[PDB]
């Protein structure tokens, strides 16, 4: 009842792959951030540009919830001005990011015996991603001078690779669920407020 659907994002049964990260647009609702302080296992609750307590006392035109799954060691890459595979090829935040990055271990949900191969990441790309860019291309990466023509082989690699999460993997290689909340206050009246 007039409450923003944060539970649909955080409590989702399945999360998107990082290269195809899911975005939920939230507007015209009363946002209760208190329900997002509940989950203890939070590995990261890093907010840039705003204090967590002032969020309940602020109004924004829109909010965007970007959800995906990565490995633990890559959680540090979800932050302004970062480099690496995830930051450059899968999900990039702007240098002037205004929002909160939340990440928690999800080895219970996203790892399977024999490997969960449904979670993928982009390994090869011609250039770095722009902020909030989603590249879902499966085109063969031409790392050589010979055109690939869609054929995978030498100097022609498939751009996507699978994490293959297993429950016995080290904590740095275990799956982590990430939700990025971006608060947009642009040339328009605010529609999301805390109460």
């Amino acid at each position: 009842t007039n409450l923003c659907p944060f539970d649909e994002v955080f409590n989702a049964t399945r999360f998107a792959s990082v290269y195809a990260w899911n975005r939920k647009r939230i507007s015209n609702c009363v946002a209760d951030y208190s329900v997002l302080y509940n989950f203890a296992p939070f590995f990261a609750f890093k907010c840039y540009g705003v204090s967590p307590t002032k969020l309940n006392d602020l109004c924004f035109t829109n909010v965007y919830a970007d959800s995906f799954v990565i490995r633990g060691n890559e959680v540090s890459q979800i932050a302004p001005g970062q480099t690496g595979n995830i930051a450059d090829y899968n999900y990039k935040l702007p240098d002037d990011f205004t929002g909160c990055v939340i990440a928690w271990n999800s080895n219970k949900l996203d790892s399977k015996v024999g490997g969960n191969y449904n979670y993928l990441y982009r390994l090869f790309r011609k250039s770095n991603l722009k902020p909030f860019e989603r590249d879902i291309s499966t085109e063969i990466y031409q790392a050589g001078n010979k055109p690939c023509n869609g054929v995978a082989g030498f100097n022609c690699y498939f751009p996507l690779r699978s994490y293959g999460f297993r429950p016995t993997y080290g904590v740095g290689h275990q799956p982590y669920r990430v939700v990025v909340l971006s608060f947009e206050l642009l040339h328009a009246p605010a529609t999301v407020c805390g109460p």
């Epitope: 633990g72 060691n73 890559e74 959680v75 540090s76 016995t168 080290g170 904590v171």
Partner: antibody
């Protein structure tokens, strides 16, 4: 052979701080996930903390989160546990141990001899 | 949090007898179930990982079995050095948890 040596413990007053250190030899420390486990006198084993091989991922037990910080220096084969705001409930033998999944040993196969930590007034 | 229960708390057996030690998990163990031995004044020693795989250098009189929430450590014939405390432990669920331990002592 594989050797882990812990130090930096001893007697400390409640609210004090300690910096436990573990020195590793005989294996590739930089490719080893490390844990701190503790054992109170007359009690069983209790997990304290974990740090990944690169140091980018850490996890803590609830009773120590916000007070303990685990870290590592791979160039010096060093594992560290900074313990602040110590309470009497932290009195224990602290073991540094390795989770050897990179060699398909999915358990804590290498343990140190442990270092005694006594928190008392 | 997976809570590990160990049965029985204390086991009195004679040398040469077989020993069976039980570890029960409050919920499914998705990762690895391990068994460790500890002697007074010493660090724990890994006996079994993956609930059935024997650690390097561990005598073959030690075996492990089980899955899900039920696990067993078996010692086919007890040697004098085998009378100690035994712990089970799970990896894969956080926090990492240990059972409270089972003490094996000599029956006389």
């Amino acid at each position: 052979d594989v050797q882990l040596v812990e130090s930096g413990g001893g007697l400390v007053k409640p609210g004090g701080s300690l910096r436990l250190s573990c020195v590793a030899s005989g294996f590739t420390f930089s490719n080893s996930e490390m844990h701190w486990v503790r054992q109170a006198p007359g009690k069983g084993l209790e997990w304290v903390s974990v740090i990944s091989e690169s140091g980018e991922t850490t996890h803590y037990a609830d009773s120590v989160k916000g007070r303990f910080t685990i870290s590592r220096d791979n160039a010096n084969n060093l594992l560290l546990l900074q313990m602040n705001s110590l309470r009497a409930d932290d009195t224990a033998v602290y073991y540094c141990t390795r989770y050897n999944w990179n060699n398909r040993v999915y358990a804590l196969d290498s343990w140190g001899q442990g270092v005694v930590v006594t928190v008392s007034s | 949090e997976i809570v590990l229960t160990q049965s029985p708390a204390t086991l009195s057996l004679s040398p040469g007898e077989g020993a069976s030690l039980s570890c029960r998990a409050s919920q499914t163990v998705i990762g690895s179930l391990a068994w460790y031995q500890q002697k007074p004044g010493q660090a724990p020693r890994l006996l079994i990982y993956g609930a059935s795989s024997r650690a390097t250098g561990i005598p073959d009189r030690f075996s492990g079995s089980g899955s899900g929430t039920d696990f067993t450590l078996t010692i086919s014939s007890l040697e004098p050095e085998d009378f100690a405390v035994y712990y089970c432990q799970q990896y894969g669920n956080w926090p990492l948890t240990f059972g409270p331990g089972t003490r094996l002592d000599i029956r006389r």
